[model samples]
Target: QSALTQPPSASGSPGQSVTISCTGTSSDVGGSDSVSWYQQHPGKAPKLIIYEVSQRPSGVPNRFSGSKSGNTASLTVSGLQAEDDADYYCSSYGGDNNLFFGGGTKVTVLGQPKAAPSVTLFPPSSEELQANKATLVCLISDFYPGAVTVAWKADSSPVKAGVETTTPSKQSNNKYAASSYLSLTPEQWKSHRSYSCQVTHEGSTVEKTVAPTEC
Candidate 1:
């Protein structure tokens, strides 16, 4: 009733092969023969690529393939084209009428840097600040190459706990987007400590900071 477990992300060089694996339980992919894979660009609808375990639909490229063997299901990108730098999802039936879905496994393709990533930081909902916890989101986008990173800092300290960052995934224009979430406590936020998002890529780094201020 929940979902299949998919890897968070991965990478490959141009012309190289890439595999995004989906592992499921006996209630779904492992036991069902009705497994399927779908492909989606940033804003486009999901297109059924591989279905019934490993069969490709009409007009689908031969470079994309799918297979299911025991506890894992795999969708293969035999060639790393710019088009393959996208989000992929898998689905399977629970033998009856139950439908189970997987997550977006961002497949990244490495190449020359077209541009440095633009950075934006979204403060947690001020409405939600009534609670004892908050989250800070850093949005990274409009870049190529897979070697980008965003680090979190609070005042003079590096944020280690409650930090979750995503791999850079593709956008509609072959540009990529990455996301990072930093968990915060009301005490830390109320202390008026400055929080910084340091996004570094290629030779350039973009910065943003948010601190509590008087109304």
Candidate 2:
């Protein structure tokens, strides 16, 4: 199942309240009671803040509360403090014996900027075709909050082999860059009517497409 949907960023001033919502199908957040939320500070392990829909873990302050309404579960932080600024993610038990997680949100206590990446797709390069293997690269760059999800899709049923995506790496400008690769044979490449790269940042999606040599 796809991860639950969430806003890319939420913000509030100190002493204010900010609420973030995670939405999924009825089979997940609605039908089941096993929904949870997590908080992660920079370079730190994610900590469970709320579990079983609305219960806080021991030692967690009451400033954080959770609730559900139908297919959406919400996490509200009241009396927001500077310490509350961090990344948040939601999880739910879903159908198909799968546990789902959200892409995550950046919460700013005093209001900061979030950067969305620029996606560039390079079609199967001629050099790469030297080995009779076509490789496509989707370059995701200049993103802030330092994380994004990438996906590759074809007009028809996708060929699932020889696909690899790299983890985000910091550039000299302090922005992140990552790439996704796809390998195909000349026949397989021509067979697809269209190919595209999709990237999700701050919970919003952007796509770039390429056609057969129409470059």
Candidate 3:
């Protein structure tokens, strides 16, 4: 019933390798076969590095790899890419048909690399409720090019029917970060029980889920 258990600490040298572990009960990560990992820069939204347990999304460097045994899933970055230094997260599908994220890991890349913009959800403190209208927002710190779309899913059911929007953000270095907002009534959110903010770009999907709570 609790969130997945992750080590509060992990580290490796500049050129060496390291691994972060996500341990959970059968009702959470361990209970499901789908697990993934993500990387986030201090001010940028997180990006998917590993998906469906060992499958790396396109454009993700080969250095990042994923593996699982029993209820324990791991994300290993080999050849220590300098860009690897950032915040790392391990995630999985929970019993409520929701996805769960590990606390997070801090990567210390020896060389300085461009950090992605951070994604912030409004009502930053937290939301506790079983039913209520809520606004979901995604703020990308760094911007990247190409079209982007926001997806809404409850448990695994889609709620973004006949809804779509496209907006432009400031561009920089062939990349730009934009903010997207979606409004949903409490009933729509309640029916799904769990919610996920899935971002699709250039044929890849990256996501973050709201933690399990009253809302």
Q: Model 3: runs farther than 4 Å from truth?
A: 110-215
- Once fitted onto the true fold, the runs of candidate 1 whose alpha carbons sit more than 4 angstroms away are 112-215
Top candidate when judged by TM-score against the true structure: 1
Residues 1-215, model 2: lDDT tens digits: 58899999999988899999999898889988899999987677888999999999998999999999999999999998756788999999987789999989999877434779989998887776677877788889988777888777887455466778898975655467899888768777788887888899999998888777863
The better-scoring model by lDDT among 2 and 3 is 2
TM-score, one value per model: 0.54, 0.52, 0.50
Please give the CA lDDT of all the candidate structures.
0.82, 0.85, 0.67
Pairs with steric clashes in candidate 2 = 8-202
* lDDT per residue (tens digit) for residues 1-215 in model 1: 68788887988998899888888888789887788899888768989999998899999999988888897899889878777877888999886688888877988877834788888887767776777677888988888775687788888678788888897876766777888888887777677578899998887889899877557
Candidate 3 residue-wise lDDT, 1-215, digit = tens: 35666776666666788888888767766676789888886668899998888998989988888888888998888877546667888888876578788888786645433344445544222352334545556555453443566776667777655334447453433245666665766555555656666777656666766633454
Q: TM-score for model 3?
A: 0.50
List per-candidate RMSD values in Å: 9.6, 13.7, 18.8
Candidate No. with top lDDT: 2
